[PDB]
Design an enzyme around this catalytic site. Structure first.
Site, PDB file in Angstrom:
ATOM      1  N   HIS A   1      29.471  34.088  67.391  1.00  0.00           N
ATOM      2  CA  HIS A   1      29.126  34.881  68.726  1.00  0.00           C
ATOM      3  C   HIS A   1      30.324  34.868  69.456  1.00  0.00           C
ATOM      4  O   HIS A   1      30.765  34.426  70.535  1.00  0.00           O
ATOM      5  CB  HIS A   1      28.245  33.814  69.269  1.00  0.00           C
ATOM      6  CG  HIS A   1      27.011  33.593  68.570  1.00  0.00           C
ATOM      7  ND1 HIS A   1      25.795  32.987  69.002  1.00  0.00           N
ATOM      8  CD2 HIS A   1      26.344  34.012  67.337  1.00  0.00           C
ATOM      9  CE1 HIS A   1      24.731  32.943  68.343  1.00  0.00           C
ATOM     10  NE2 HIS A   1      25.318  33.482  67.351  1.00  0.00           N
TER      11      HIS A   1
ATOM     12  N   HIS B   1      22.324  33.270  72.020  1.00  0.00           N
ATOM     13  CA  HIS B   1      22.022  34.289  70.630  1.00  0.00           C
ATOM     14  C   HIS B   1      22.192  35.689  71.450  1.00  0.00           C
ATOM     15  O   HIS B   1      21.459  36.127  71.980  1.00  0.00           O
ATOM     16  CB  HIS B   1      20.832  34.021  69.700  1.00  0.00           C
ATOM     17  CG  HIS B   1      20.860  32.765  69.301  1.00  0.00           C
ATOM     18  ND1 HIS B   1      20.458  31.520  69.804  1.00  0.00           N
ATOM     19  CD2 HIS B   1      21.189  32.769  67.848  1.00  0.00           C
ATOM     20  CE1 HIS B   1      20.586  30.623  68.916  1.00  0.00           C
ATOM     21  NE2 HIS B   1      20.872  31.035  67.691  1.00  0.00           N
TER      22      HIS B   1
HETATM   23  C1  LIG Z   1      26.956  36.044  60.538  1.00  0.00           C
HETATM   24  C2  LIG Z   1      26.523  36.252  62.030  1.00  0.00           C
HETATM   25  C3  LIG Z   1      25.367  35.701  62.499  1.00  0.00           C
HETATM   26  C4  LIG Z   1      25.048  35.911  63.857  1.00  0.00           C
HETATM   27  N1  LIG Z   1      23.765  35.541  64.067  1.00  0.00           N
HETATM   28  C5  LIG Z   1      23.294  35.931  65.247  1.00  0.00           C
HETATM   29  C6  LIG Z   1      21.768  35.876  65.671  1.00  0.00           C
HETATM   30  O1  LIG Z   1      21.007  35.077  64.942  1.00  0.00           O
HETATM   31  N2  LIG Z   1      21.462  36.024  66.956  1.00  0.00           N
HETATM   32  C7  LIG Z   1      22.197  36.679  67.817  1.00  0.00           C
HETATM   33  O2  LIG Z   1      21.690  37.080  68.928  1.00  0.00           O
HETATM   34  N3  LIG Z   1      23.565  36.905  67.507  1.00  0.00           N
HETATM   35  C8  LIG Z   1      24.259  36.536  66.114  1.00  0.00           C
HETATM   36  N4  LIG Z   1      25.358  36.873  65.859  1.00  0.00           N
HETATM   37  C9  LIG Z   1      26.331  37.718  66.903  1.00  0.00           C
HETATM   38  C10 LIG Z   1      25.658  38.884  67.197  1.00  0.00           C
HETATM   39  O3  LIG Z   1      25.231  39.355  66.233  1.00  0.00           O
HETATM   40  C11 LIG Z   1      27.071  39.691  67.589  1.00  0.00           C
HETATM   41  O4  LIG Z   1      27.955  38.963  68.645  1.00  0.00           O
HETATM   42  C12 LIG Z   1      26.882  40.916  68.049  1.00  0.00           C
HETATM   43  O5  LIG Z   1      26.061  41.795  67.105  1.00  0.00           O
HETATM   44  C13 LIG Z   1      28.181  41.633  68.209  1.00  0.00           C
HETATM   45  O6  LIG Z   1      28.015  43.044  68.698  1.00  0.00           O
HETATM   46  P1  LIG Z   1      29.140  44.302  69.123  1.00  0.00           P
HETATM   47  O7  LIG Z   1      28.508  45.642  69.421  1.00  0.00           O
HETATM   48  O8  LIG Z   1      30.065  43.763  69.958  1.00  0.00           O
HETATM   49  O9  LIG Z   1      29.886  44.235  67.531  1.00  0.00           O
HETATM   50  P2  LIG Z   1      29.221  44.804  66.102  1.00  0.00           P
HETATM   51  O10 LIG Z   1      27.746  44.820  66.002  1.00  0.00           O
HETATM   52  O11 LIG Z   1      30.163  44.152  65.115  1.00  0.00           O
HETATM   53  O12 LIG Z   1      29.722  46.552  66.106  1.00  0.00           O
HETATM   54  C14 LIG Z   1      31.083  46.959  66.080  1.00  0.00           C
HETATM   55  C15 LIG Z   1      31.009  48.230  64.913  1.00  0.00           C
HETATM   56  O13 LIG Z   1      32.431  48.824  65.079  1.00  0.00           O
HETATM   57  C16 LIG Z   1      32.606  49.334  63.943  1.00  0.00           C
HETATM   58  N5  LIG Z   1      34.289  49.452  63.820  1.00  0.00           N
HETATM   59  C17 LIG Z   1      35.214  48.566  64.024  1.00  0.00           C
HETATM   60  N6  LIG Z   1      36.219  49.318  64.399  1.00  0.00           N
HETATM   61  C18 LIG Z   1      36.161  50.510  63.962  1.00  0.00           C
HETATM   62  C19 LIG Z   1      37.071  51.629  64.028  1.00  0.00           C
HETATM   63  N7  LIG Z   1      38.376  51.512  64.169  1.00  0.00           N
HETATM   64  N8  LIG Z   1      36.317  52.767  63.637  1.00  0.00           N
HETATM   65  C20 LIG Z   1      35.136  52.692  63.517  1.00  0.00           C
HETATM   66  N9  LIG Z   1      34.266  52.038  63.550  1.00  0.00           N
HETATM   67  C21 LIG Z   1      34.701  50.601  63.793  1.00  0.00           C
HETATM   68  C22 LIG Z   1      32.285  48.011  63.081  1.00  0.00           C
HETATM   69  O14 LIG Z   1      32.182  48.510  61.557  1.00  0.00           O
HETATM   70  C23 LIG Z   1      31.079  47.647  63.606  1.00  0.00           C
HETATM   71  O15 LIG Z   1      29.897  48.319  62.946  1.00  0.00           O
HETATM   72  C24 LIG Z   1      25.736  36.719  64.609  1.00  0.00           C
HETATM   73  C25 LIG Z   1      26.893  37.033  64.224  1.00  0.00           C
HETATM   74  C26 LIG Z   1      27.357  37.012  62.811  1.00  0.00           C
HETATM   75  C27 LIG Z   1      28.966  37.495  62.227  1.00  0.00           C
END
Ligand SMILES: Cc1cc2nc3c(=O)[nH]c(=O)nc-3n(C[C@H](O)[C@H](O)[C@H](O)COP(=O)(O)OP(=O)(O)OC[C@H]3O[C@@H](n4cnc5c(N)ncnc54)[C@H](O)[C@@H]3O)c2cc1C
Ligand SMILES: *[C@@H]1O[C@H](CO)[C@@H](O)[C@H](O)[C@H]1NC(C)=O
Ligand SMILES: *[C@@H]1O[C@H](CO)[C@@H](O)[C@H](O)[C@H]1NC(C)=O
Ligand SMILES: *[C@@H]1O[C@H](CO)[C@@H](O)[C@H](O)[C@H]1NC(C)=O
Ligand SMILES: *[C@@H]1O[C@H](CO)[C@@H](O)[C@H](O)[C@H]1NC(C)=O
Ligand SMILES: *[C@@H]1O[C@H](CO)[C@@H](O)[C@H](O)[C@H]1NC(C)=O
Ligand SMILES: *[C@@H]1O[C@H](CO)[C@@H](O)[C@H](O)[C@H]1NC(C)=O
Ligand SMILES: *[C@@H]1O[C@H](CO)[C@@H](O)[C@H](O)[C@H]1NC(C)=O
Ligand SMILES: *[C@@H]1O[C@H](CO)[C@@H](O)[C@H](O)[C@H]1NC(C)=O
Length: 516
Positions: free
Chosen positions: A457, A495
């Site tokens: 997270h 979460h």
């Molecule tokens: C294994 C794991 C289990 C988890 N379990 C939970 C859970 O059960 N419940 C919960 O609430 N949270 C959970 N989390 C945490 C939560 O899922 C994340 O903190 C949240 O999804 C992050 O969202 P975000 O939009 O910041 O990033 P992301 O959802 O990772 O989105 C970023 C996106 O940008 C893309 N990207 C990156 N750089 C580039 C670029 N230069 N060009 C184009 N695309 C790019 C990536 O491919 C990705 O799809 C978990 C995390 C992980 C890793």
């Protein structure tokens, strides 16, 4: 809870407006470009497409290519798979030495995560000092939950752990609740009761199919700039060829590339600390000392028990919440190969029978580090990331409190049937890896420090108040925003996916309101 989703197939209707980034006809002018088709980015793009022309750019492929992302039963499989640069799980190791992962797929980390769904602690909004529209926040949670969140069915191991949390004093009993509140509860899940994974990609189905375009295998390598304004992006396709797209008029670029991806792309684009970027001979567009600073990873600490009789595998649904620690337990089949980052190093002993992973999360955390570039040019080379686990003594004190509470949990009548030996002590459990120590804080401190893992997270690196204003705009730059987990220095809850799903649509609605 009238509005919650029900059991349903994963809805891939949005594929009708998903295209390979090789298609040069995607190049041109848009009202909005969203970088990163992840947790925040999908609902943000869908929301802006209600009125305006949107291009969503995602570096990964579509989840149909990796079917083990679409079931609860596939969770460990995705982490076990070798990272060949195309897979949905990208492996990394922090400079601290702790193995970790991030997503590389349309739907982002919602396609690979453990499914747990919670709304933010209601105290979070006023702690930020942002002037939230709280009624709209709640409508927005309902808009997410209607598509992808269920009330979980009973699971034997989750019920055992909930009885244990209550017996151990993690009170009160909140029953079924989406809310982050002190006590023990059943929360929502983005796995349905048939084991189907629902995710952020499905929120693309709420976009207007006449206005939303999605390019996959689109590696965004640079933000383009002009009064300094973002105007566009450069992205490469899977063959390596470059492409450009631009915003027009009062439109905007939003970076939704994650805690890791957003600061990396800002730094590569010349937005960040002046002497650092100058050190690399990157031309500074906008000096900001905080880009890739204040990066946080909430510690995970755990014990593993091996019951003498098989337990049923579960997904996490039952949470034991205190202000100073957030606890859960996963029951799992044994692992024949390591699920990368599940344990913090590759040499960790693997379970050869069913096991319970019994976990505590440190809040905040108060310890922070940074994202810095490894390559000054290549966005496909992962940046350097350091979290500085337990550099702040408050974090260590809170891990000691969480570990003592896990001791209490192991002493409950709820957990007694899972001991190998019917002795008075918690040494009657069989452990995989290191058991809890006992009494004196020093043994607990050593345990916390030595056995830490990532909770997964992680957050920060583009904070509101440091890099962004209260509208998520990059300070000093027009037509540029950031919306993803890079934006906050503390958790919204145990979460955070629910919060960052909501935040994507919420900021989209703020953009459409600001513009009207
Ligand atoms: C294994 C794991 C289990 C988890 N379990 C939970 C859970 O059960 N419940 C919960 O609430 N949270 C959970 N989390 C945490 C939560 O899922 C994340 O903190 C949240 O999804 C992050 O969202 P975000 O939009 O910041 O990033 P992301 O959802 O990772 O989105 C970023 C996106 O940008 C893309 N990207 C990156 N750089 C580039 C670029 N230069 N060009 C184009 N695309 C790019 C990536 O491919 C990705 O799809 C978990 C995390 C992980 C890793
Ligand atoms: C789920 O099913 C119930 C009927 O059991 C219905 O009231 C509700 O609208 C359904 N929810 C969604 C989001 O489709
Ligand atoms: C895009 O097209 C290339 C061939 O030009 C192919 O190798 C790649 O798999 C395609 N990607 C997607 C996501 O369709
Ligand atoms: C928002 O919903 C929460 C429960 O998630 C509730 O406690 C709160 O009062 C609601 N706030 C408003 C302004 O409706
Ligand atoms: C449950 O999921 C499977 C695919 O794993 C599918 O065959 C089945 O139709 C689904 N069940 C229900 C009740 O929708
Ligand atoms: C930056 O460029 C200057 C030449 O203008 C050179 O002296 C210096 O070594 C360069 N530094 C790096 C890290 O490329
Ligand atoms: C809710 O958040 C606030 C910080 O704003 C904190 O005081 C409180 O401990 C949190 N509650 C729980 C149960 O995490
Ligand atoms: C790049 O990453 C590796 C670890 O992945 C590290 O050994 C190396 O020192 C890093 N290079 C730079 C320039 O930071
Ligand atoms: C721990 O972090 C808090 C920030 O909330 C700070 O006030 C405190 O001084 C920090 N301690 C150390 C040793 O950095």
């Amino acid at each position: 809870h009238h509005h919650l989703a029900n059991t349903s197939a994963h809805d891939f209707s949005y594929l009708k407006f998903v295209y390979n980034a090789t298609d040069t006809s995607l190049e041109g002018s848009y009202d909005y470009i969203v970088i990163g088709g992840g947790t925040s980015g999908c609902p943000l793009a869908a929301t802006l497409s209600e009125k305006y022309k949107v291009l969503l750019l995602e570096r990964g492929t579509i989840a149909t290519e990796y079917p083990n992302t679409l079931t609860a039963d596939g969770f460990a499989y995705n982490l076990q798979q070798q990272d060949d640069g195309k897979t949905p799980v990208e492996r990394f190791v922090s400079e601290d030495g702790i193995d970790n992962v991030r997503a590389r797929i349309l739907g982002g980390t919602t396609i690979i995560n453990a499914g747990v769904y919670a709304r933010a602690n209601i105290s979070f909004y006023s702690q930020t000092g942002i002037e939230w529209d709280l009624d709209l926040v709640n409508k927005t949670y309902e808009w997410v939950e209607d598509a992808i969140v269920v009330k979980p069915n009973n699971q034997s191991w989750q019920s055992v752990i909930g009885e244990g949390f209550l017996e151990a004093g993690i009170l009160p009993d909140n029953g079924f609740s989406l809310d982050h509140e002190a006590g023990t509860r059943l929360t929502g899940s983005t796995f349905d009761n048939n084991g189907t994974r629902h995710a952020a990609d499905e929120l693309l189905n709420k976009g207007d199919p006449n206005n939303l375009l999605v390019a996959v295998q689109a590696s965004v390598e640079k933000i383009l700039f002009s009064n300094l304004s973002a105007i566009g992006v450069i992205y490469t396709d899977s063959d390596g060829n470059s492409h450009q797209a631009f915003v027009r008029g009062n439109g905007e670029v939003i970076v939704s590339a994650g805690t890791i991806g957003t600061p990396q792309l800002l730094l590569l684009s010349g937005v960040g600390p002046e002497s650092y970027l100058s050190s690399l001979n990157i031309t500074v567009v906008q000096p900001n000392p905080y880009v890739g600073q204040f990066v946080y990873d909430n510690p995970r600490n755990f014990i593993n028990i091996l019951p003498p009789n098989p337990i049923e595998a579960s997904v996490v649904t039952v949470l034991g919440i205190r202000s100073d620690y957030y606890q859960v337990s996963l029951s799992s089949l044994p692992f024949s190969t390591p699920p990368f980052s599940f344990f913090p190093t590759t040499s960790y002993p693997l379970p050869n029978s069913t096991f319970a992973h019994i976990v505590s999360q440190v809040p905040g955390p108060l310890s922070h580090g940074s994202v810095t570039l490894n390559s000054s040019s290549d966005v496909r080379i992962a940046p350097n990331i350091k979290f500085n686990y337990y550099s702040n003594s408050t974090d260590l004190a809170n891990c000691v409190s969480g570990m003592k509470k896990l001791g209490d949990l192991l002493r409950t009548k709820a957990l007694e049937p899972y001991k190998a030996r019917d002795v008075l002590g918690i040494d009657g459990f069989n452990y995989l890896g290191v058991p809890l120590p006992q009494t004196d804080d020093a043994s607990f401190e050593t345990f916390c420090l030595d056995n830490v893992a990532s909770y997964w997270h992680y957050h920060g690196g583009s904070l509101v108040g440091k890099v962004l204003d209260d509208s998520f705009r990059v300070m000093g730059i027009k037509a540029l925003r950031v919306v993803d987990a890079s934006t906050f220095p503390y958790e919204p809850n145990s979460h955070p996916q629910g919060f960052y799903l909501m935040l994507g649509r919420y900021v989209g609605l703020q953009i459409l309101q600001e513009r009207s």
